[PDB]
Structure formats: structure tokens, C-alpha cells
Amino acid sequence: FFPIEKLRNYTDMGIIREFAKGSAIIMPGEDTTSMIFLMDGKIKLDIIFEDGSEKLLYYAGSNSLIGRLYPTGNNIYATAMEQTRTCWFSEECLRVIFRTDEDMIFEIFKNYLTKVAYYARQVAEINTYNPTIRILRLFYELCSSQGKRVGDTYEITMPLSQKSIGEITGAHHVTVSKVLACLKKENILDKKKNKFIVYNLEELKHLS
Amino acid sequence: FFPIEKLRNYTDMGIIREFAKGSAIIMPGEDTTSMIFLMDGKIKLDIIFEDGSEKLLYYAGSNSLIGRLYPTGNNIYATAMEQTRTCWFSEECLRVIFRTDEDMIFEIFKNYLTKVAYYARQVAEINTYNPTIRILRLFYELCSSQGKRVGDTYEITMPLSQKSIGEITGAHHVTVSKVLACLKKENILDKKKNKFIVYNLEELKHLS
């Protein structure tokens, strides 16, 4: 939640906007330009990916500070959980605040510093290790049952999206992409759209 | 990488420190109080959790701004990849960069704000323990691309141990066993040894 009490002290300079339960406060595909100080209530912010699929991003709460001040490659979609009162802070507004009171620059900066730490930790905590073994297993398995030695190699005539792959192994699309890529590099296998071609069943199996 | 060019403009106010390849630039359990502006080179950040397990966290490179000005909850351990030249910015140092120039407040804001956008997306992008939605997914995938419409039904001539199935989805032989069995009595599919027969591809795809 990452509160900034010290900011209540200034909402009297921002613009106050007030949202009923259910009301959309940030819209998908919209160009945000204000810090949104959450004086009271609760907000759900869902992210919407390049493929229309939605997914929760975070809840914000009292004294929380949301919002693109500049476009952040994220389509968001925020909603009010309860009756929520916000104070909107423009850049222009923010400047004045800082001039009365310069310590405020640093609490906005603390705020953000923890925010990065906190999510950065949790990426790092994602266990990318099994789910990588699991991926290979999938390919060996597919291969040694569907695979068709074509000369040196083995072919499978199998559509298989990275999505499907992550969906099947529970592996992050990043892992999926990077695991793929360096399997291709090291000559073990390469996946086309219609076909994967295996270059080294001996080794594939070896990493599992 | 998350650069801030506009900060090379102010190294002259910071204190410049220069680290050779392999040099440590944060020791573990080292309480940091200065933003670190990476002028040229490369830096390795590993996080160390409460249980002494290390992991990579990120690489930082030219114009990158690493550092905490405050405690974050993360034990970090940073290392030089090549010879690298950093400028270190205190809070006290920073306050002065922001009076000369108030436009650099917002740059540090934009920056961290991207960084927060970036990591959070990554957390949202992720694939809540499933493990049973995983299994089905597999079977739909196999089935629609490998099945031959045999009258009412679709067959796939495909050895598939339950061992292989848990190995792939990282699901427990029980879960597998139980997920299989009830798929049989609810008429969606049964799996023989050489062969699985899909009674109801319409439903399979639904259960996912």
C-alpha cells in the first residue's frame, strides 16, 4: 500500500474527485497525467495486456499514491471498491508544493523507492527453476512419441504457442522465451509455427 | 536499463568512485545512503533473501541509477562486470541538484515510475497455481492437432504415462490420477496405454 501521510497536508492544492463503488477512475487506453492521492477508500487497478486479457495489478488504499505522471507502457483500469475520495496532483501543482516544502520531494521519492524494491523482490522470488526443467520435459516427451526422424533430426508437426507452453507448465512467458531462445542457440531444438525440429534429442533428455 | 542521461550533467556535484572488474561496490548487509549513477561499465545486482539464498536481480549499465537513499528491505550485493565509473549522489547532494534544477526532480520520478510499471507488469504476468487447469490444457492441446475424428470421438495414438504428465505439469501423481478418473466418469475423456479417446472436445476446452 505504501502510504504518504505527509501529503494529506496539501490536498487543498490538488483537485478533489470522488468515486462511488463500482465507478471507473482510470480507464483503459487513456493518457494519464496526474498523481492520484488516495485520501480515503480503496481502489483495484487491473492491467490489460496487448491481448485484451485483464489481470489484477494492485489494490491501493488510504494515503496511497497512484498514477502515471508520464505514459508508463501499461494499460490500466482502476475501479473503486468503496466510496473513495482522491486528490489529483498535477505536475504544475507538484512544483509549488515542493517550493513551500522540499522534504516532500524526498517522501515522494521514498515512496517510489520502496515500490520498486518491493516488486523487484517478488520478481526475483518467482521460482523460474523447476518450471524450466518442466518445459524441457514437455519437449522431450512430445518428441520421443510424436517425433519423426527426418535424417539427422526429429520433427513434430505440432502447433505449440508459448502461451500454451506457459499455460501447461505454469512458467512465466519470460522464462518461456529465454528458455526457448538458448535451446535454439546451443543446437538442441528450434520451434517453428507448424513444426519443432529437434537437433539433439541426446542432450534435450540430458537436461531433465 | 532505465537510463537517465540528463544526470551526467551533474556528476560534477557528486563524488566519483571508480571500481575495477570484480570489485565489490556494495557488500552484503551494507546500509546504503546514496544513489549511484553508473557512468560507464556494467553492474551485477544479486539479492540475498532471509535464508541466505542468492539470486540475480539485475544488471545495470550506462546512465543507470542504482542505489537506495533509504533502507528498502532488500539485502543487495553489487559487483563490477568490467571497469566501471560511478558518481554517488547523497540526499544532501540531491537537494542541491534539485534547486539548480527542478526539472531533474521529475526525471528521477519518471524513472522510478517506469521501473515500478516494469516490475509490476511482470508480477501480474503470472500464472497462479493451477495445476489441474494445467493438465486439461495439455490434453486439449494434444487432442486438437493430434486427434483423428473416429466417428463420435477423437483419438490420439500417443503414449502418455501419468509420470510424464506430472513431470510436465508439475502436478502430483494423485492429482493427475484423480483428475483423470473423473474426466472418465463425466464423459469428457479416457486415456488408454497407446491411446486417449476424447468423448467431448467441446467441454474439455471449456474446463480451461
Q: Is the dihedral of CA A145, A151, A156, A161 positive or negative?
A: positive
- Give the type of residue at B80: A
Contact B156, B196 (CB under 8 A): yes
- Do A161 and A74 lie in one domain? The reply is no
Q: Are residues A93 and A196 in the same domain?
A: no
Contact B65, B44 (CB under 8 A): no
The domain that holds B164 is classified in CATH as 1.10.10.10
Name the residue among A172, A162, A65 with its Cα closest to residue B128.
Answer: A172
Whether residue A120 is found in the same domain as residue A197: no
Q: Are residues A119 and A134 in the same domain?
A: no
Clarify whether residues B108 and B143 are in a common domain: no
Between CA B97 and CA B199 the distance in angstroms is 70
Nearest-CB residue to B73 (from A106, A117, A173): A117
d(CA A202, CA A154): 11
Maximum distance among all Cα pairs of chain B, rounded to whole angstroms: 80
Cβ–Cβ below 8 Å for A116 and B115: yes
CA distances from A72 to A94, A141, B125, B190 (A): 19, 41, 16, 48
Q: What phi and psi values does residue A32 have, to the nearest 5 degrees?
A: -70, 145
> In angstroms, what CA-CA distances link B38 with B2, B108, B109, B117?
11, 14, 18, 22
Domain boundary among A129, A152, A184: A129
B66: Cβ–Cβ under 8 A, 6 or more apart, which residues? B35, B36, B38, B43, B45, B60, B78
Chains A and B form CB pairs within 8 A to the count of 154
DSSP letters along B107-170, please?
HHHHHHHHHHHHHHHHHHS---S-THHHHHHHHHHHHHHH-EEETTEEEE-----HHHHHHHHT
Q: Cα-atom radius of gyration of chain B, to the nearest Å?
A: 27
The answer to whether A73 and A42 are in contact (CB under 8 A) is no
Distance CA A86, CA A93 (A): 15
Is there a single domain that holds both residue A102 and residue A36? yes
CA pair distance A116, B117, nearest whole angstrom:
9
Residue B102 DSSP class = S
The Cα–Cα gap between A79 and B91 comes to 36
Q: What is the CA radius of gyration of chain A?
A: 24
Q: Do A113 and A144 share a domain, yes or no?
A: no
Final residue belonging to a domain, choices B99, B129, B159: B129
For chain A, how many structural domains are there in total? 2
Q: By what method was this entry solved? A: X-ray
Phi-psi map region of A16: left, alpha, beta (phi>0 left; psi -120 to 50 alpha): beta
In total, chain B counts a number of residues equal to 208
Distance CA A72, CA B184 (A): 48
Cα B130–chain centre separation: 18
Q: Give A68's contacts in chain B (Cβ within 8 Å).
A: 113, 117
Instruction: Using DSSP, state whether A19 is helix, strand or coil.
Output: strand
Same domain (yes/no): B125, B141: no
Side chain identity at residue B201, one-letter code: L
Residue A170's domain comprises: 130-208
In angstroms, the separation between the Cα of residue B185 and the nearest Cα of chain A is: 23
Compute the distance between CA of residue A81 and CA of residue A89 in angstroms, rounded to an integer: 21
Sheet holding B64-66, edge to edge: B15-19, B84-89, B35-40, B64-66
Beta carbons of B116 and A119 less than 8 Å apart: yes
Provide the CB-side half-sphere exposure for B160 (13 A, CA).
25
Instruction: State which of B103, B129, B155 marks the end of a domain.
Output: B129
Give A50→chain B minimum CA distance, Å: 12
| Closest by Cβ to A168, choosing from B68, B118, B138 | B138
Measured distance CA(A40)–CA(A87) in Å, rounded: 10
Looking at the fold, whether B55 and B141 belong to one and the same domain comes out as: no
Does residue A138 share a domain with residue A65?
Answer: no
Q: Find the CATH number of the domain harbouring A85.
A: 2.60.120.10
Task: Please check whether residues B197 and B187 belong to one and the same domain.
Answer: yes
In chain B, which residues have their Cβ closer than 8 Å to the Cβ of A55?
124-125
User: Domain check: are B136 and B108 in the same one?
Assistant: no
Q: Which three cell numbers stand for residue B183?
A: 474426466
Residue with cell 502461451: A163
B189 within 8 A of B197, measured Cβ to Cβ: yes
- The three grid cell numbers given for residue B51, joined into one nine-digit string: 535464508
3-class SS at A107? helix
CB–CB contact B146 A169 (8 Å): no
